[PDB]
Amino acid sequence: CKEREEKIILVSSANEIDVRPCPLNPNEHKGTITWYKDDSKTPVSTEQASRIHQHKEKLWFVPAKVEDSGHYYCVVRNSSYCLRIKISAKFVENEPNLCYNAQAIFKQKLPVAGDGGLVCPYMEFFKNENNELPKLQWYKDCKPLLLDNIHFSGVKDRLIVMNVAEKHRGNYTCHASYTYLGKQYPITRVIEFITLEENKPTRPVIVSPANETMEVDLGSQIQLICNVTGQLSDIAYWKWNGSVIDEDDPVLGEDYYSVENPANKRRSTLITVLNISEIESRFYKHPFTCFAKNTHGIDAAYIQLIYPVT
């Protein structure tokens, strides 16, 4: 059925509501999606009651306990093809004397315009509160925030921080309360806010290869798309066994594209397809890694091609 694993774990607070959509791509996002717990068995119940149930193609952890931490699998069985995806998900309770646990605190890789710009991440599927996103209550270092519009302001899923003669360093929490079946549970995120801004401390960000493993067979051939989001002067290039793809390599080929962003120059995308005429037993030994430089940093991500199981 061809497996694909997402090596990155998505840590989230326990005793809350949580969703987990299928990290899918273009040519694969087709009919039929199915979820399971560690290993293959009977799929997570669609029974709308039950704590852990699937609904609208997503995996819903209603009270999301700690004993739910692990690997979940997502399957796409169209008719001719099927795709199983391993994801890894951790649920953590807050450290003693804190309204949060360090493991679940996010950090933005690419900033937005303004002295603030905090965006409560992962609320998209909760926007389902009758089409509009529920009123977000905000915090800083665990203490409540008054959205009076002179110190801070609340708009949709964002939190604008006003330019006061203040230290903004802190661990901000966004809080919503979803109502499901005549009872509501909390939803929280924590984003760490810094000082790096104004000039251009923005290094390129590789969105495509997301530290994952793909299962392919020796005979066949593939194509690996590296997608970056940065300025048109940044650079996206693939490497293997600690070396850039040879400009005259027989099996491997590297094409560099660029998609300009009219809306925002600073945030355009760069594609670098690494073609592979034929998979070889030497490629199963190391991971393929995309790279992106800009003199303000370097970002790197990978995809590990592994031999199909017994």
Binding site: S69, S88, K90, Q103, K107, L110, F125, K127, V155
Partner: peptide
């Protein structure tokens, strides 16, 4: 308004303090 999506949250966010399973 163009509110953040999940694909967008994955793309432009990461957990530096997160630990393995």
């Amino acid at each position: 308004e163009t509110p953040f999506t999940w694909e967008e949250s994955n793309a432009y966010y990461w957990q530096p303090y997160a630990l393995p399973l």
